[PDB]
């Protein structure tokens, strides 16, 4: 890849909400955003695996982040979406209450989480701070890892 230095190209975070809290992902990790509809529940899976979607002929497992993180089960509406990401070279869907904004940030303002924070640090890449808000940048790596093994993943 040939890079350009003509003008500043800031880190852009897609900010979404889960109940009363703000979370983010780098736009680079956001492949697409689909509506939170027609999730087919799959028997014998963990509760946080809401099910699957059929997206253009591909099976995509969808996680409910509130169930994964232990967040209050409030905030769902028509604004709900499924953010398509890639975890270990596989497509995955993350349920969110809404994509609110896309904000530029200095990557160097992102702080490592303390040992114990809003959600398990296993799920936290770093902590950014916007408006007068805390934004946890989610780490995608282990979202599907149940004990030593990946569910519906690998």
3-state secondary structure of 13: strand
The experimental technique behind this entry is X-ray
Over the Cα atoms of the chain, what is R_g?
A: 16
Tokens found for residue 50: 């809401």
**Whether residues 36 and 77 fall in one domain:** yes
How many angstroms separate the Cα of 25 from the Cα of each of 30, 63, 100? 7, 15, 12
Resolution (A): 2.2
**Whether residues 63 and 85 fall in one domain:** yes
The enclosing domain of 102 has a CATH number of 2.30.30.40
Report chain breaks in the chain, C–N > 2.5 Å, as residues after which they occur. none
DSSP for 88-130?
TTEEEEEEESEEEEEEEE-GGGPBPPPSS-SS-GGGEEEEEEE
3-state secondary structure of 140: coil
Q: What torsion, rounded to 10 degrees, do the Cα atoms 47, 45, 150, 72 define?
A: -10
Question: Which is nearest to 97 in space by CA: 83, 86, 118, 84?
Answer: 83
Which residue is associated with the tokens 């994509």? 99
| CB-based burial, 8-47: b 16+ in 10 Å, e otherwise | eeebebbbbebeebbbbbeeebbeebeebeebeeeeeeee
Residues whose CB falls within 8 Å of the CB of residue 104, separated by 6 or more in sequence, listed in order: 10, 11, 12, 13
Q: How far apart are CA 55 and CA 59, in angstroms?
A: 7
The enclosing domain of 148 has a CATH number of 2.40.50.180
Question: Which is nearest to 69 in space by CA: 112, 18, 105?
Answer: 18
Q: Is residue 4 part of a domain?
A: no
Give the distance, in angstroms, between the CA of residue 12 and the centroid of all CA atoms in the same chain.
14
Range of the domain at 133: 10-30+98-138
**Whether residues 118 and 129 fall in one domain:** yes
Q: Is residue 5 part of a domain?
A: no
């Amino acid at each position: 890849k040939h890079h350009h230095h003509h003008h500043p190209m800031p880190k852009k975070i897609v900010v979404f909400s889960l109940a009363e809290e703000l979370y983010g992902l780098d736009i680079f990790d956001v492949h697409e955003v689909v509506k939170d509809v027609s999730i087919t529940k799959i028997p014998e899976t963990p509760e946080f695996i809401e099910g699957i979607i059929n997206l253009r002929g591909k099976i995509i497992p969808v996680i409910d982040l509130k169930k994964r993180f232990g967040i209050g089960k409030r905030g769902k509406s028509k604004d709900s979406r499924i953010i398509i990401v890639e975890i270990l070279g596989q497509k995955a869907g993350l349920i969110v209450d809404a994509v609110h904004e896309v904000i530029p940030i200095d990557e160097n303002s992102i702080e490592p989480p303390p040992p114990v924070t809003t959600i398990d640090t296993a799920f936290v890449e770093g902590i950014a701070k916007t408006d007068d808000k805390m934004i946890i940048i989610i780490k995608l790596h282990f979202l599907f890892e149940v004990n030593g093994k990946e569910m519906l993943l690998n």
